[PDB]
């Protein structure tokens, strides 16, 4: 007895197919998860013979919330901390943001997706800290739904860490995830730190999970993430009238089997909604967009908003904005 809700599957496929066409993209995937049960409510590939739900990509900015949660847990920062976000060098490598800010709050670090801010959190913690947190939220763990190429992503078992490697890991690079893995991360965010397996078969709630992160810290960062879908945030194009949403939008470049990059982009948005009491985790990935826009916020955020808004209406979720 499958967990997929065919209403949600049909609107996910419709919106994903339209976004793949609009962006003149090779393909796209979307995965929708119930943050209380781990049930997969929708899971779509576009086109339907391009089996991209299990393709791996560097998760980029979608890991930044986990970096803020870890820094708060370790007491590197407090809830109202302000970071110095002036660009600087790590081992000769210039660390910069899209836009230069001299300083950001922790909310600003997510709103502006500050590489400078998250690098300073990372280099204030042992290299083991983010390795442990990412693992707690399921990165490097198999998903077990029975799909071709499924497996466990590309996750470091690293003995030795340069400063720049510690920083790029906090940015979400030098590791790879599947859409299913990332959806499970965001389901663990939506539950406020309860890790549950994905299911393509129905379960009866409540589903006991593994406590992998304190509720207070995860909820703190979910509220900070709301800024990303407000003006001046990287994910404003994902905003849904009537709802608070907690998202991150990001971009990777495609890696060949030689570990060399080619000039094909992977645009993604991951999120939970409604942010007041999450119901759903959603991941949308657009592969090789070719209509002159390449980044997550431009390419994948609009379809995140179209799909999540359609889900919230279909499932009669009460609007939680204002």
């Amino acid at each position: 007895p499958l967990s997929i809700d065919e209403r949600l599957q049909a609107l996910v496929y419709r919106e994903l197919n339209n976004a793949v066409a609009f962006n003149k993209a090779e393909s796209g995937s979307a995965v929708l998860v119930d943050v209380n049960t781990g049930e997969v409510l929708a899971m779509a590939n576009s086109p339907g013979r391009n089996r991209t739900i299990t393709d791996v990509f560097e998760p980029g900015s979608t890991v930044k919330p986990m970096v803020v949660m870890t820094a708060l847990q370790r007491g590197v920062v407090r809830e109202n901390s302000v970071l110095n976000t002036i660009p600087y060098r790590i081992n000769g490598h210039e660390i910069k943001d899209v836009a230069r800010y001299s300083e950001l709050t922790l909310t600003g670090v997510l709103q502006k997706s500050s590489n400078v801010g998250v690098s300073k959190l990372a280099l204030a913690m042992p290299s083991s800290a983010l390795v442990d947190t990412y693992s707690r939220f399921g990165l490097g763990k198999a998903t077990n739904l029975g799909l071709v190429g499924e497996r466990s992503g590309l996750y470091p078992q690293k003995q030795r860490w340069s400063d720049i490697e510690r920083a790029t890991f906090s940015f979400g690079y030098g590791l790879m995830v599947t859409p299913l893995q990332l959806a499970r991360v965001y389901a663990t965010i939506g539950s406020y730190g309860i890790y549950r397996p994905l299911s393509i078969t129905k379960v009866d709630p409540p589903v006991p999970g593994e406590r992998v992160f304190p509720e207070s810290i995860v909820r703190t960062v979910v509220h900070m993430m709301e800024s990303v879908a407000l003006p001046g945030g990287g994910g404003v194009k994902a905003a849904i009238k009537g709802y608070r949403i907690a998202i991150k939008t990001g971009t990777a470049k495609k890696v060949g089997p030689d570990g060399r990059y080619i000039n094909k982009y992977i645009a993604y948005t991951a999120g939970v909604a409604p942010a007041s009491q999450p119901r759903f985790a959603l991941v949308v990935v657009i592969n090789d967009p070719q209509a002159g826009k390449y980044y997550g916020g431009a390419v994948s955020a609009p379809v995140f908003g179209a799909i999540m808004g359609g889900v919230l209406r279909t499932m009669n979720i009460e609007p939680d904005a204002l």
Binding site: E58, G60, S61, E94, I95, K96, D97, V98, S113, N115, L154, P156, E165, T168, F171, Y173, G174, L175, G250, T251, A252, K253, V255, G259, R260, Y261, Y295, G296
Partner: peptide, 14 residues
């Protein structure tokens, strides 16, 4: 140039 995993391409930071 960039390479995976030792010198990744990073959004917003050349």
């Amino acid at each position: 140039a960039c390479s995976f995993p030792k010198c990744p391409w990073v959004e917003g930071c050349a």
